[PDB]
């Protein structure tokens, strides 16, 4: 009848962040040993997509989790669908892929107010092609030039010689499909260890 743990999960430190990471270099924050209130996140109510897998989001608040990881990145509006288990797309195949047995949540909200500027922001990149598909939660930030050509590239972008990463270029005048969206993916395991507490 008396509470032990006094630690708030630092969701603010992951959401009120100055600049999110590029989708090819998605940032991950280890969450542990803290209480979290998901009612405040859903009540913020600005998110365009707040969908959870393995557990209904409405009844998420009264469960105890372990190995909670928050992955943050920025993608295109039309690319939101790709952040889901088993989806095939430009991003999911080569940038960030949820596994088929996914257990976490996906949060996505429009960032056209901050992450685009007149003339465009080209600081958010995506990996166009990769030699092999990415494994779940695999993080590959390599910048090795494809040199399918006579001469060796020697680390110079050019012709017969292509660079993997492509700039997004969000302008505030873009279509909603091309507008930038900030995404946070929560990976966790459902824990039922104390029968009374987590039953």
């Amino acid at each position: 009848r008396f509470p032990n743990i006094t630690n708030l999960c630092p969701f603010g430190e992951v959401f009120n962040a100055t600049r999110f990471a590029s989708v090819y270099a998605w940032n991950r924050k280890r969450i542990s040993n803290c209480v979290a209130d998901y009612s405040v996140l859903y009540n913020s109510a600005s998110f365009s997509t707040f969908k959870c897998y393995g557990v209904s989001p409405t009844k998420l608040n009264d469960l105890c989790f372990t190995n909670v990881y928050a992955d943050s990145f920025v993608i295109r509006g039309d690319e939101v669908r790709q952040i889901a288990p088993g989806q095939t797309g430009k991003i999911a195949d080569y940038n960030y892929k949820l596994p088929d047995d996914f257990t976490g949540c996906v949060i996505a909200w429009n960032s056209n107010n901050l992450d685009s500027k007149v003339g465009g922001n080209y600081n958010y990149l995506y990996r166009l092609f990769r030699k092999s598909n990415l494994k779940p939660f695999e993080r590959d930030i390599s910048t090795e030039i494809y040199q399918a050509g006579s001469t060796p590239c020697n680390g110079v972008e050019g012709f017969n010689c292509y660079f993997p990463l492509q700039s997004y270029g969000f302008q505030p005048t873009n279509g909603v499909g091309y507008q930038p969206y900030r995404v946070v993916v929560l990976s966790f395991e459902l824990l039922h260890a104390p029968a009374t507490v987590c039953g």
């Binding site: 608040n61 966790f188 104390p194």
Partner: peptide, 15 residues
């Protein structure tokens, strides 16, 4: 309860 597991708010009340 156990330090090192992320409790939800209502489950932290039950704690």
């Amino acid at each position: 309860x156990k330090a090192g597991v992320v409790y939800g708010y209502n489950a932290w009340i039950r704690c």
